[PDB]
Amino acid sequence: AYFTGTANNPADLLAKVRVHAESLGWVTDRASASEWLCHNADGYWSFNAGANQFQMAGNTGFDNSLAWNAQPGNSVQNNPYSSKGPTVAQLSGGPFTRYHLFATAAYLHLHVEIAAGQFRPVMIGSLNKRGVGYTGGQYVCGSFIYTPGQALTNNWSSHPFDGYHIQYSNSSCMLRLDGLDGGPSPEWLPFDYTTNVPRRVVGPGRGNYSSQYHPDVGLIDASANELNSSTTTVPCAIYAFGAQQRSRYVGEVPDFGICNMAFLAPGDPLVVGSDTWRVYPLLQRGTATDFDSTSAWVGYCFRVV
Amino acid sequence: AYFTGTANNPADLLAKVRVHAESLGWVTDRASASEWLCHNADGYWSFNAGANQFQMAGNTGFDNSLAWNAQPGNSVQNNPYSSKGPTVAQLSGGPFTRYHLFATAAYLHLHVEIAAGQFRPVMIGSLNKRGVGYTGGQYVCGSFIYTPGQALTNNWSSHPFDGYHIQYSNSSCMLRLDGLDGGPSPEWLPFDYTTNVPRRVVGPGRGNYSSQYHPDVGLIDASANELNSSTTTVPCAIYAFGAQQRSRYVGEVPDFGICNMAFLAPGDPLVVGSDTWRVYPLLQRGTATDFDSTSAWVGYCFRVV
Amino acid sequence: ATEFGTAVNHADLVERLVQFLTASPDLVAAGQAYEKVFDNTIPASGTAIAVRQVTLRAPGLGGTDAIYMGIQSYGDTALDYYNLRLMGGTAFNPGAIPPGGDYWTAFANYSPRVQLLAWNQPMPYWFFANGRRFWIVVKVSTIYESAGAGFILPPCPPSQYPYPLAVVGSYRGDVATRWSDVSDRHRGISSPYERSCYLRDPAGRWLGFTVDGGAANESDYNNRTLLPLGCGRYAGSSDTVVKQLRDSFGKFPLKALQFVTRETEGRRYLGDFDGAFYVPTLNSGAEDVIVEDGVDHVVFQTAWRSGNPWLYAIRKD
Amino acid sequence: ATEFGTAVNHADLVERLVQFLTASPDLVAAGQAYEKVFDNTIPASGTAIAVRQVTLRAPGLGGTDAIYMGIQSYGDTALDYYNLRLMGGTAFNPGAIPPGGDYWTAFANYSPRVQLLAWNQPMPYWFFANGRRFWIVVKVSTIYESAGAGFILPPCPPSQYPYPLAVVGSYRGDVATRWSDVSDRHRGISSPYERSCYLRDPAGRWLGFTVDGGAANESDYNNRTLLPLGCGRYAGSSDTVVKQLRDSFGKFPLKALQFVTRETEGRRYLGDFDGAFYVPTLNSGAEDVIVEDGVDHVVFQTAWRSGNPWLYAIRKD
């Protein structure tokens, strides 16, 4: 359920997380030191480990004779982007201080502390349908950094479930929504807002950025209570846009919420109800208005079981 | 301690209050059906009952051969006023709904409901020295009405302990302060502000009137708490102005407070501590801003024993 | 707990409401019926309809809460309106009524009044009530009028915040208005504007919430708004997802309405409407009933316009 | 609980303050000593003095309360101010300090800082402390300066309002100042001005109080003031009784200081200063001691001037 450890290189994280997944019962169609083609009862995913980053891509079928980024129904070719690039998570090429892994039969969440105050979360899983009848819902997210030294959370940067980013080559996260507007079933909608594409998805990823497009940004802003120092979990709703510019609620991320870290430390416990919550910063804590050099006080909450 | 009754004429109240005072040990030097010359261990007072009003005056010595308003050291001749008028309490024809009487060995307080919603307070006693060394301190107050039908609480009106009034003939209340600024011991300081007389006294009498001169007016305004609907007692501090506009705090009114009735009815109880409080309106309840036709919500919180 | 019908006039409506509150089978069986502590008609009507004043007591679901409301009926024949006013408080005291004036001032922590617009005629109605809150909806031709009050559900224990009283109405009760008005200030519960929704701050302060700013309104309330319909604060464009929300394969998503305040001093989250949710408009409308997990919800729209951001659904249980 | 002495410098002054809070015979015997939950020096001093950060916890008289406070010693040699910043809160969390930045933000329900002005040279001092509040006064040559924080005494049971925390200082802590300032904003506790006294509302909202209004200050705080020195709200003349207050036959009357808020929403009485009163200036001044009912009181004057409104006394026990 909850695991911790250390890793000098990304390959060590890769090895330990595959060990954990196999121990849990995850089905790995192909396994290698750097390339995976795994799947579960929900969907298919493929991952590749680079020198200082991870490359992720969705999948719908298997073919061992094809490359890691050429599986049937791959997201590289089945996306509105003209660049045709897969998901990317930009990590470091050095010793990672620590990581925290949440493993389940339906989703996998990873939070890696590459260095003191530096964190790189990775999310894979499927959204809770909540009784809504739709095919797909598999989401794969990565962490991207624009430029070290300069504004780390600049406008061009992209984050998991982001709702406002500027980039023409790569996307930090992506979502699957099959059979939208009568199109072919294989559809891998990315998180973009400025491309004006007929079909796209948006999320509260960035948290409380100035130009974030989501109605719950205020809820995340007020997650902290000045009265009793109490914090509440806000469901992370995902919205999708159709050809006719008519939005449709699609669901929420299982066992995941956002809250302000204005009055809590990384990993501080606050048990709300019978369930227990683990809260860690997205990238790096700063001040309230430090939306350029760090991630401000946006906190990722995971339900620990 | 606490008495109630009815009186068809002012003479009835006269008889009942003298009976109560005598039963409580008060010493009456001379008594009659309409005139009084009484005293106690604190001071001397004289009262006269008119057709529809009471005439009161302080005293320092006794002389049975002198009229009711001609006793030694009488306030009529020993006051800065050029008119040389005694204290006056203006009432109605005599029909009284009820009267509430508070009697003690040191002070006497009366509140008569002349008619439905009409109340007239009468005050006699001495201020609590509170360790302050001064001779005198006896106070006698009455209730005066400017004109029925028109603005009842007009500027020209005067009230017990009033801090703002316009009148050249009569005063609603007085206060004794002997030997002020090296003058002769017999000195009866009236409650006036606009005469610019070298020596005068002021009080919170009017309550929370717009042009009321007292620093606690805010305390009276905020006496009612919106948090728990709780009400507190505010001591009725009195101020005396010296020969050259130098004020000297003199004391507080015993067993008396002035309190807001925004959220309370006449006579409702609100026990604060081991002591119990009785609250009855000054003249007549109105709205918040009705400072002309009625007495707004100024309240007289007393201690009942 | 729910009642649908037609009242021959505004008076008929008010005694229908009181009988529903005091004799509904669920209310009486569960011991949740409300108690009438005051009922008078003080004014001498001239060229106006008789004014009925009612104040009722409320125990709440647990029976340990003390909740007090007030209801007034006010109308004028010359202008042809029969406004019904509402207010709340924490204590009542009949003797605290001045000669003349009015009685609503006697309420402890008295709050400005809200009102519902109607007139003397057969009006279809909808009643929703519970031990902690009540909701009123009236169908006026093509216009739907609504209001209500009760307790919100804060995420904090009731021990330290036992009085989360909220009062909401279509229009401010400080002035008399005719139901035929077409001004934008006249709207529903989901979108308060110009003193249309008051809530008791844990500090006993009736803070007003407005989804949109207004010069006439006090500057204090501009910083506290209803986020779900007030997404414009952060969005850099007039058109946002909320205005373009639509069903998903025939399923109507129900979105909770939140209370939030963000001033210089601090931030806090207060609670959520109990039984009120926002829903889209396309391919739907008022009077519509949607079933989600076995509980039905009715659909209603604001009088001003029937647009996407001015349409809400209310749980009927 | 009381200590009179001379601290060789600001660092030694804070040192003596902490030793007084720890080992004072009254505090230790009664078990009212505070606990130090944090003490660090994060910054790398350049052309400035070392910065000391301290966070302490007070249990209160009954031992069931939770009080958190922080003290900072910020100075700049090239400008020669050794300011001592103060602030309060309800909880602390050392891990909530961001890389860089500061730690005072980690406080739960953080409040703007107040401060104390002095510099590195021997300085007479007057320290008053109790389980619920503390007072600091330093005689800076021609200037008397003072500050403090603690719990006020509301008239309501502590069951529902257990955190009446108040912080007051001579000047706002948002800017750096030289103790030779010539602005009217630099004054004492009895009369705050321009964010000089903050009080935590029962709704967890830090409400500042100012005796006199100010365009720079927020509009909300104008209507809430300290009545004793704010008599000008109702008086129709510049000269009032309070300005002309004087002793009576050698007896100096002590007047309690007041907290009151009169807003549009409602009114409420918050509490009084514990151990601070208003007294006149005539035939008296600073370093004066007056005994009332066997209890002594010291006399201090504001930095601005020693005028009648600009003077207050502190109980010494």
Author numbering:
A (entry chain m), B (entry chain S): 2 to 306
C (entry chain k), D (entry chain c): 2 to 318
What's the paper's own text on this?
Bacteriophage Casadabanvirus JBD30, from the order Caudoviricetes, is a temperate phage that infects the bacterium Pseudomonas aeruginosa. The virion of bacteriophage JBD30 is composed of an icosahedral capsid, long flexible non-contractile tail, and a baseplate. Using its baseplate, JBD30 attaches to Pseudomonas aeruginosa via the bacterial type IV pilus, whose subsequent retraction brings the phage to the bacterial cell surface.
Reconstructions of the whole JBD30 baseplate and its parts enabled us to assemble a composite map that combines the localized reconstructions of the baseplate core, receptor binding proteins, and tail fibres. The bacteriophage JBD30 baseplate is composed of a trimer of distal tail proteins, three tail fibres—each composed of three heterodimers of gp47 and gp48 subunits, three upper baseplate proteins, a trimer of baseplate hub proteins, and three trimers of receptor binding proteins. The upper baseplate proteins together with the distal tail proteins form attachment sites for the tail fibres composed of three gp47 and gp48 heterodimers. Three tail fibres resembling bent arms protrude laterally from the baseplate. The baseplate of JBD30 is terminated by a tripod formed by three trimers of receptor binding proteins (gp54). The interior of most of the tail tube is occupied by a trimer of tape measure proteins (gp46). However, the cryo-EM density in the tail channel is not well resolved, except for the part in the baseplate core. Residues Lys1149, Arg1151, and Gln1152 interact with Ser59, Asp61, Ser64, and Gln66 from domain I of the upper baseplate protein, and thus position the C-terminus of the tape measure protein in the middle of the tube. Methionines 1130 and 1134 from the C-terminal domain of the three tape measure proteins coordinate a putative ion positioned on the tail axis.
